[model samples]
Target: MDISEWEKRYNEAYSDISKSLKKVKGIFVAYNSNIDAIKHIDEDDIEKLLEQVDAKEVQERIMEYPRQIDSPADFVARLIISMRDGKAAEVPTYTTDIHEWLTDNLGFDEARMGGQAGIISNLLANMGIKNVIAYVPWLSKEQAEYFVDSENLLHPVVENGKLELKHPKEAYNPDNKPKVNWIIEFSKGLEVKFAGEKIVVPRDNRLIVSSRPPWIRIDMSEELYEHLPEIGKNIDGAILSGYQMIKEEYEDGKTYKDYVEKAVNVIKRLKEGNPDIRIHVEFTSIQNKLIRKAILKDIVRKHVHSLGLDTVEVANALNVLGYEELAYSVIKKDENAIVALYEGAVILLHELKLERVHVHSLGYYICVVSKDSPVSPEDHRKSLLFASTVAAARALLGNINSLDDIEAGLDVPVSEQGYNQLEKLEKYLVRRGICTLEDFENGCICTPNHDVIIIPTKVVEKPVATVGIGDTISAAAFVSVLAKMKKK
Candidate 1:
């Protein structure tokens, strides 16, 4: 398998996930919906400091924060709380400048390197949120690796009916007895000749490793737990409303054997409008591919069982040649059911092992809505586009130095590929009416907007595996954007 593509996609998705904090900052500011209050701060002071901060430095400083805050919202809350508390203190007010204290004592060197902090500082300066803003960097390699590897993601192994941590050492060990057999075959292009007047080029040889049971463990942030309730509430509301809307819209919807396939065309249309962006999805050298396939098959079969159809029957009807086929078949039968199944499978898959879905060189901003969320189905599609845009903005400004003169102040070269991708994505959004062309064009590097419209958040360096980077990226971006627009 070509692992390079996987690695590239993973990095992009990972970048996006990290960048989410920047968008969340914007989101927070927007959420506040009070521009006047936030605008009271000295924009000049904020802008002066913002000009000095760098993204890489901010990325480094953001790490001083708790690697796993209770929630994304809580992460922002802490910054505000910290600033509020700092202001309420006595003796020279303990600190006259909350922004300085945050940038200095918070272990943040906002001016040292280019990264999320610089973008955020610039945005905060413009939004007047600098005084209350604190940059939270991503976890260090050792810390992140340890945090992911050591942390136990709890989920049931349905078959055993016992709750256990995913990825047991025994199952993942190379020396363990293998229950699966793998075949390796190489192309006929391999050849060798004698040493006499012959080249010594080696022939390509293929190798396959086989394994049994578990292979990887899923990494879940401890921070997600704190905000899960809020997320859950949001999802629940969206789902409930969506379900009702679907019911009403498809009053004459098609039904097939215990499955309701309502305006299935709508689902297809929505997917067509916004194709799946590249997110990191990983498979190992062992049997991850086959195993994941089997897992998805099993999940679909179980769902079919509930509907009077067996796995064999559905499998036969769909002629499912791969895991994807089986997954799609389920969705075709019942969109809602497929959504539910996907969620369950996601939870199960996480417990079974770690899998990464990486985005390419670009970072992503993902927002996962449950089948039961309050957001409308229509809005879900729009949100995905919103995420992609925010991601593009972050990448463009990753190396920018000043809030003013962004066009000329950018110390880094413009990324040709990044610009293309961002524009293409922007066009898609505008065509779909998800966002206006004005907003999209104005945010791009082509324009000379001095105001930092977006900030960078959660910068990831030394890329690793990238499963679920999109979701994390989207979540982070959405949350950060909220923070940035908090008072607006």
Candidate 2:
């Protein structure tokens, strides 16, 4: 396809998508939301931190995959490796005192809302969705203040035997304390001398020292769960996250399986009144094999209609589900990436018996949908295009707080490199006789095994911030697709 053709689709797509956005009446976002202690760190901060911490300690910690932060030094260890890999990662920290140590030393630019549910709820509300029922079990006064002050955004409460919509601030639990996570952001070309060698950050990304405050439990409140069916009947869909915060075993004698069972129950009640309601599970990096396996086996395989992940996250998901070879190919990310991604999505779709699998790579995205999906393949691509625009907007502007900001992203050029990758995918499909160029041009392919949707997304060369971009992509696309399904 020519540049003009792609540009024309983007322009028209956003207008169509804007109308689709208005059609979306309400959405439910759950389980994860917190405040982020943000800081844009450079070489100076790295050098100063290393002066206090031993290089060997940092090296040993990074030797293992990124893990929970026990001390301030452990935070640096994970941050350095994330920069080296040029990937964004989030590792939970148990104590709140680490926040103080981070502040007393490295300092933070500001505290902003962090976590998937919080970010997605705000984005959808700003895009004109009428009701975004956000549920953060640990929403404290300080945490509630960070939610965008919009009437369209709300929290559900049981008042006098009825479920009522209320502002998050008014609904916040005064007894709950705010949880803070460190946002260690690094830019491309930022040089850091670590342990005897210099490692320059290859791309712009952030390492999140996530706080999992001891007092919080990663589950739905019983009050809310009891009323879920009532809430679910009115909403179009739900987005679930924070399952990664569940450890294999908790001090209170609860196991990951217990939480997994609770999650399954949550999904079941949400669908009791609205069985057709879409449920999207935003998959993140899970360090615990047992927890990750349980989620993939129990909740995701059952009630999850759609699953979202980035390139690396796709590999993580695949690895947990016993497709190790496919996971490795996903990580390699060469010319064969398109093929690997498609195969991986197909495998996951069938393996999990899922309705949809959405994988977002750097410049493009690949999705496989069951023939039973409510939305057609063309509608699916439109959602991806809409999501791509919103993601670019998030990258260009630190926060997409209003409707106008979303439109600004429409003017951003679609990535030409994304199209090049699409062409490669088309040629491969044609060679294999799976589909003709014409079928691919329509933005999807029909196969005996499953259906595939492919689209080249917009890319921001240097994003303003990389923290919530994934949530932006997944939430916008999932809900946009749901809006299209509503017409049926």
Candidate 3:
């Protein structure tokens, strides 16, 4: 309720947050990076594209896009369906390349960083972190160029039989093809007619059409995998992403389970040098339910210390984990939405046995941390505030290229709607006997199961773009929390 109080908190904790970022030796990011060719199109564009494809075939693929994108018809149909529903979905391309008709018709405005690791690593590097080691299976020269030039931004390579950290430009192989995601972005309340069905976009969301050429694979180099333990020694923690690209089966006889096992081993290798290192997995609405379940159960449950996602992703995650109705309620954003989000986060935290589950929503963030988590309530609040500020800066200035540019967000105010959500969540918890208003007010509720942290974030009325904001929030808050923990 007090804007001055949040502003005061932001001012007081700025030094500690920034200093913590500098003190960290390194943070390992991996397994995904890409060029996001973002395009903003309208109904006329979709209608034009649809004319080239069979109407019947397109209809069949509306639901099919949630799993696999088989043809141009499927692509066009699913793109319309996602826009109509106002939800984000990722569908891997079944063909070796996207048809020229598709890309030729729907042109993108900008080609920015696309994958979780790609976006987060770039943001961290710009924040002037000491070292940000990122890995993309398909780190083509084109993709490498998108990564801002930074001495501290690096990739793992082996030269002369020794492990070395080098910039992605030096590390990326020229022959490798770039993995690009076509982000079809739309704003809330935009009405569009789709094949006689008239509907309005409910929120700002993008349908991510992931280009998964049969040749592309999410493989870690033998050198990188072997050197991770040594590389992880100075690492404060690691942020793992892009595993959603894993296919059910590969031409080389690799199953999705095979890659899942490999991903688990990769995390294990990172933890070998520093067992206490926290690993956070940034999630998405993966096209494959099997892959989603496997990653959540096999990888996240066992290795990940923290899990991060937005509301729709939380719904998608819950759906896979057997909380179907709850997942449905989550995306509806009704009166019960906040409680459902809190409950959903707690479910994920307990189900995965994760130390923390951070859910970033429109105006607020809800975090469920283990009762014994080393990070404190005050520091967590500050971390959320720091992340929110950075989010506003990201919105105000589409891109953050310097450490000083982060200050621009200081001018943006914390969202009043975020505070409303907090109060809403508080009353539910208090009424449920989970915590008192006193406990809820001191950061947030402290239940017997886990301690909850809530912070309303800053909002930008009209953002330059919404593509990388979630990545910006997660990476900012996660690193800020780690920075605070490292000083401890």
Candidate 4:
């Protein structure tokens, strides 16, 4: 796409959609909500912290390059072992252990609301959505207080063992363990180790590694399970997160198959309650368990109407779906990888029978909508603009407080890399006969099989935080589309 043409199209689309949009009545979020402990640190500080803990080997590995450490217990154990040279680190620590380590040793600068569903709810509420209900399976009294007081979220009541929404003066505690995930975020100009090599973090890149607890499962109570279908009756739409009820231990008495079955039942229940309800699933951290990954993929493909994922997540999904080589290509961001990403999205759109598929990266967003989807190309374009702008706001302001705040600074900066990604996507679309140079010059062209839309997001050169960027993008786009459909 020509730079001038792309800018014109984006401006026109934003102008048109901004004028006709209205607030959506209700949006429900399910299954994933947790507390986020975010800490910003330099490479030297991290090295010092590691040394303070005495994790010489793990510290050495991390300093070698930027890499992912999957096990939360392992990540914490290495640090705790550095703290005490004993068998305590050899034996696995649970939620309490991790929490203590985070509080006493590596202190977090901020403790805010997080989790895909929780963040999405926060974004929608800020975007002026009227009723935002977050259906969490397990929440502590303290956690619930945070949601109600800090986030303005409604608490669910069990009326004779059935789910009902109510405004609670006091938060209720859950029967099970509370889910907690700690995030270690890296800022720009910070030298970090990744994949056994050292590289300075890019200005626009939001690099992070999470330490998620093993007990962070999403098992709903029996009351909530029985009332699952009630969610569709009250809400116009629902955004579901991938984290829930994961069986981490052999003695947990649950398997991947059981989790998949439970998820499918909930999806079916929602559809049965309101067939017209819009359902979007945000695929978050699914760990390295191939069986669980496959099961989750099947759940989304078979039931959900829309799906959202980041670049790494897209790669992981492709690998699970038996496209390992293509997945690696996308992960590496190689030549023609942008095309492969779009192609992968299209493949997922058709194979999963989803109405829409969204794949967002560091600087740009790409989405494919089925011909039969309720959302139009224009609507998709508007959603893209809305999402990208909200991301810009989140990057600039570090949080979502109100729609006016996001609108106040709609003209967020776009990095050169963002424009280049858009150009590559446009060229690939042209080659696929989806559009032409003339089409873009005039504006957008609507096509069959899959209608494609790509937008270069405004980049925040120095972002406040990268924690909720993905959730913001997905929430803005999904809610905007739902609101547009409601207007129609």
Point to the candidate with the largest lDDT.
Answer: 2
Ranking by TM-score: 2, 3, 4, 1
lDDT of 4 by residue, 287-390 (tens): 66565465546577768888888888787777777788878888786657887887788777887788888888887888888888786787888888778877
User: Number of clashing residue pairs in every model?
Assistant: 80, 0, 0, 10
Candidate 3 residues lying further than 4 Å off, grouped into runs, are 38-109, 182-209
Question: What are the lDDT figures for the candidates, one per model?
Answer: 0.26, 0.83, 0.81, 0.67
Candidate 2, position 398, lDDT: 81
TM-score of each: 0.25, 0.83, 0.82, 0.78
Candidate 2 lDDT over 1-488, as tens digits, reads 46676667777777787887777767899988888788999888878888878888888878886578887778888888888886678888888777767777788888888889888988887777888999988678878888878898999766767767799978887766678877788899988888788998788998888788766666766778788888888888999998888877788888888888889888999899787788999999988887888888887996798999888887887898998988898788688877788888888899889889999888888899999888888788788888888888888888787777887787777788888888878998999999899888767799988899887777888779888888889888898898887634
Winner by lDDT between candidate 4 and candidate 2: 2
lDDT for residue 86 in candidate 4, whole number 0-100: 21
Report the alpha-carbon TM-score of model 4 versus the true structure.
0.78
The residue-level lDDT of candidate 3 at 335 comes to: 81
lDDT pick, better of 3 and 4: 3
Runs in model 1 with CA error above 4 Å? 1-206, 212-416, 432-434, 438-488
**What TM-score would candidate 2 get against the native?**
0.83
Cα lDDT of model 1 by residue, 3-62, tens digit: 243234334433433333343211111000000001112223333333444434433444
lDDT of 3 by residue, 1-488 (tens): 56787788777667678767776788988877777787887766766776678767766667455466666777777777877765688777755356344556777787777778988999999999888988777577878889888999998766778878889888877666677777677777767565567778778888777676766566677877788888778788899988787878788888888888888888888889788788988998787888888889978896888889999999988999999999998888678998899999999999889888899999888888987787887888788888888888889999888878888888888888887878888888889999887777666667778888887778999888787898888888888888878434
Best by TM-score: 2
Better of 1 and 4 by TM-score: 4
Can you rank all candidates by lDDT, best first? 2, 3, 4, 1
**On a 0 to 1 TM-score scale, where does candidate 1 land against the true structure?**
0.25
